Each structure stands twice: as structure tokens, then as C-alpha cells.
Amino acid sequence: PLRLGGNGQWQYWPFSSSDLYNWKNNNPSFSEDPGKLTALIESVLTTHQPTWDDCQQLLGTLLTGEEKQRVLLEARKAVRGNDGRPTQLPNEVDAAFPLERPDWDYTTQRGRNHLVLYRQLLLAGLQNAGRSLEH
């Protein structure tokens, strides 16, 4: 999580393990009921402003390896180019939705801007994977 500090600086705080444990174990699996975990994750992305690593941890905890892989792959399918339309250009896809830890600096606006886009894409990916599972 990212939090605006009392000194005007953005601070990184890791998820608490009790929160992670509870989110997973108080909830049905993603495959069994995609809507419940999707809603949970959407709220977490909003309220906790997680970093790229937080998102990996959140997905890793709540999803199985197969679920998580589908979700990230769907997220990358959601990347758009300048024309406001889909792109499959590796450099554009990787730039918006990196699968490897990026160099994004949470203390900077550029870095928080990348994070906002990444979380929007992740949510789309989650929604879209959920729908496939639902039909």
C-alpha cells in the first residue's frame, strides 16, 4: 500500500498478513465465484493504492497459479495504443503492463501514474477472466 505521509511524502506500507489471510480464507475461490473476489480486489486496488509488488502478492495469495496467469494475460490483452484501440506491440504492452518488476518510483508522479494505469488494466483483466470462467 501507498499512503500519504504526515510529512507530505508518499510512504510504502506492505499489506498486513492478517488482511491477506482473511481476504483469501473468508472468501470463496475465484473459479467457484469470480464476482466475490473480483469485487474484493477492486476495493483493495482503490483503497490501498498498491504498488506493482503489492499486486503480485495480492494476486498470488487470492488466486491459484492458473487463475493468476489468466488474469495477467487478460490484463495485457486490455492494453490500448495511442489510437485508443488495442495493441499487441510488445513495447507498448510491456510499458503499460510489465510482467517483470518495473523501475517505477512511487515517490514520483510519473511512477504513481504508471501504477494507476497498471491497476486499471489489472482490474479489467480480472473482470474479463471472471467472465470467461462464468460462461
Descriptive overview:
The PDB classes it as viral protein. The protein is built from six helices and two strands. It is mainly α and 135 residues long. It has a single domain, classed as Human Immunodeficiency Virus Type 1 Capsid Protein (Orthogonal Bundle). The protein has a two-stranded antiparallel ribbon with strand order 1-2. β1 and β2 form a beta hairpin. The termini are far apart.
Secondary structure elements and their pairing?
Elements: E1 2-4, E2 10-12, H1 17-25, H2 34-48, H3 52-62, H4 65-77, H5 90-96, H6 109-134
Antiparallel strand pairs: 1-2
Helix pairs in contact: 2-6, 4-6
| Helix content percent band | 55-70%
Strand content: under 5%
Count the helices. How many? Answer: 6
Remind me, CATH topology? Human Immunodeficiency Virus Type 1 Capsid Protein
User: What is the element string, with H for helices and E for strands?
Assistant: EEHHHHHH
Can you list the strand order of the major beta sheet?
A: 1-2
Overall geometry comes to flat
Class computed from helices, strands and strand pairing: mainly alpha
Ends apart, CA distance between termini: 33 Å
Q: What is the number of E strands?
A: 2
Major sheet attributes? 2 strands, antiparallel
Whole-number radius of gyration?
15 Å
- Structurally, how many domains make up the residues? 1
Architecture, CATH level 2? Orthogonal Bundle
Which CATH class?
A: Mainly Alpha
Keywords:
viral protein; Capsid protein p30; 4% strand; Human Immunodeficiency Virus Type 1 Capsid Protein; mainly alpha; 135 residues
